[PDB]
Every structure is written in C-alpha cells, then in structure tokens.
Amino acid sequence: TTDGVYRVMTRRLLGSTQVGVGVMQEGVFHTMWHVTKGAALRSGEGRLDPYWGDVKQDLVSYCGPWKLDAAWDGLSEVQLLAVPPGERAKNIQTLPGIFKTKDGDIGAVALDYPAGTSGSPILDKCGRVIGLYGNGVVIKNGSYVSAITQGKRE
Amino acid sequence: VDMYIERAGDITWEKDAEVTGNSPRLDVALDESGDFSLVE
Ligand SMILES: N=C(N)N[C@@H]1CCCCNC(=O)[C@H](CCCCN)NC(=O)[C@H](Cc2c[nH]c3ccccc23)NC(=O)Cc2cccc(c2)CNC(=O)CNC1=O
Numbered sequence: 020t021t022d023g024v025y026r027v028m029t030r031r032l033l034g035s036t037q038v039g040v041g042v043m044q045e046g047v048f049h050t051m052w053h054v055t056k057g058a059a060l061r062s063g064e065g066r067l068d069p070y071w072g073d074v075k076q077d078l079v080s081y082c083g084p085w086k087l088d089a090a091w092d093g094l095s096e097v098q099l100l101a102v103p104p105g106e107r108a109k110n111i112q113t114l115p116g117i118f119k120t121k122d123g124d125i126g127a128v129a130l131d132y133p134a135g136t137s138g139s140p141i142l143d144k145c146g147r148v149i150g151l152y153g154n155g156v157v158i159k160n161g162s163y164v165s166a167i168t169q170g171k172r173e
Numbered sequence: 174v175d176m177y178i179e180r181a182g183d184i185t186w187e188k189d190a191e192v193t194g195n196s197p198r199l200d201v202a203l204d205e206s207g208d209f210s211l212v213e
Binding site: 021022023024025026027028029030031038040041042044048052053055058059060061062067074075076077096098100102107108110111112113114115116117118119120121122127128129130140142143144145146148154155156158164166 | 174175176177178179180181182183184185186187190191192193194195196197198199200201202203204205206207209210211
C-alpha cells in the first residue's frame with residue numbers, strides 16, 4: 020500500500036498486459052472504473068478489495084473511500100504523469116481545455132496515449148493529484164481529449 | 174484472471190517539463206454509463 024503510481028496488470032496463460040494505472044494515497048488505491056470493473060487487485064502477497072465506485076464518474080477506490088480532493092484551479096498548466104504500457108513514467112505539461120457540460124465545466128487534456136494508460140494521474144504544480152486520465156472524447160480529426168476526472172472526498 | 178498492481182514511480186511534478194497539446198473548448202454531454210460525447 021506504499022504511496023505512488025502503479026500499473027494495473029492482468030496475467031493470463033503466458034505474460035502480462037497493462038490495462039491501466041492508479042494512485043496509492045493514504046492507504047487507498049484510486050483508478051478508473053473501466054480499468055478494473057471492481058475486480059480485486061493483488062498487491063505483492065496481499066489483496067485489495069473495492070470500497071467505493073461510480074460508473075457515471077468512471078472511478079473506483081480500494082481499501083477505503085476516495086482520498087484525492089485537489090482541484091484544477093481553472094487557470095494553470097498541469098502535468099499528466101503518464102504511465103504507458105511498456106514505457107517508464109513520464110511527465111507531460113499542458114494547459115487544459117474545457118469540457119463544457121450542462122452540469123458545469125471540467126478541465127480536459129488534449130493528450131493521447133494507449134488505452135492501458137487509463138488511470139494515470141494529472142498533477143498541479145504542488146504535485147497534488149487533481150484527477151485521473153482516461154475518460155474522454157475523440158474529436159473530428161481523430162485526436163483524443165481526456166477529462167480531468169476527480170472524485171469527491173466525503 | 175489475475176489482476177495485480179506494480180509500482181511505477183513517485184508522484185512528483187517535473188521542473189522544466191515538456192509542454193505540449195492544445196486547449197480545446199468542447200461542448201460535451203455525459204451519459205449514465207460514464208461516456209462523454211460531443212454535442213452536435
Ligand atoms: N485517439 C484515440 N482513440 N485515443 C484513445 C485513447 C485512450 C486513452 C485511455 N482511455 C480509454 O481507453 C477510454 C476507455 C473507455 C471509457 C468509456 N467511459 N477510451 C476513451 O475515452 C475513448 C473515447 C470514447 C469513449 N466512448 C467512446 C465511444 C465511441 C468512440 C470513442 C469513445 N475511446 C476510444 O478512443 C475508443 C477508440 C475508438 C476508435 C479507435 C480506437 C479507439 C483505437 N485506439 C486505440 O486503440 C488507442 N487509443 C485510444 O483508445
């Protein structure tokens with residue numbers, strides 16, 4: 020349960036596949052619902068069980084409630100700490116755009132990575148996780164734009 | 174189906190990082206299945 024960013028892997032008959040990424044903070048593992056669908060996660064010799072989740076937000080937490088509460092300030096550049104399959108973690112700085120919805124504006128990053136990068140954290144200048152990468156849209160030219168998806172710390 | 178996690182790094186901001194990507198302003202809707210779509 021050590022703090023940090025983690026790959027989410029599946030092993031079948033021979034070899035592993037990276038299906039996503041997540042954040043360990045305050046003893047809770049945070050990822051996007053579509054990465055695990057709530058399946059239990061092996062961590063070393065231990066097992067992490069789903070505690071909370073929401074399909075519409077596309078989020079899930081393990082071991083306890085959602086802990087990430089930093090918010091994009093609507094103004095500043097952010098960094099995607101991308102953890103792509105088969106590649107070392109790397110920071111990519113960007114100025115978010117906006118998903119304008121009937122329920123308010125959501126920051127959104129125009130950065131395109133493999134599906135198994137889902138759950139990679141998006142950071143503010145203090146290194147706080149302001150959301151997770153990977154629930155988004157494909158625009159007319161084929162490019163991808165991800166919401167900065169953040170949960171509520173109850 | 175063995176699903177498992179493995180550490181990939183520390184969560185820190187990188188000074189003097191590569192800056193890329195545009196800043197699109199998109200009208201979108203979110204359905205109850207958690208899918209965003211562009212509004213026509
Ligand atoms: N240029 C690209 N297509 N880049 C994407 C980047 C993926 C980043 C991580 N996120 C995801 O995997 C989620 C899962 C699903 C979460 C659902 N709530 N995904 C997405 O949000 C997008 C957007 C989307 C949501 N709901 C949809 C319904 C219809 C069409 C698109 C979408 N989903 C896709 O982009 C799917 C897609 C469509 C066409 C071709 C490809 C992939 C081939 N690309 C890859 O095989 C790797 N790249 C890609 O897959």
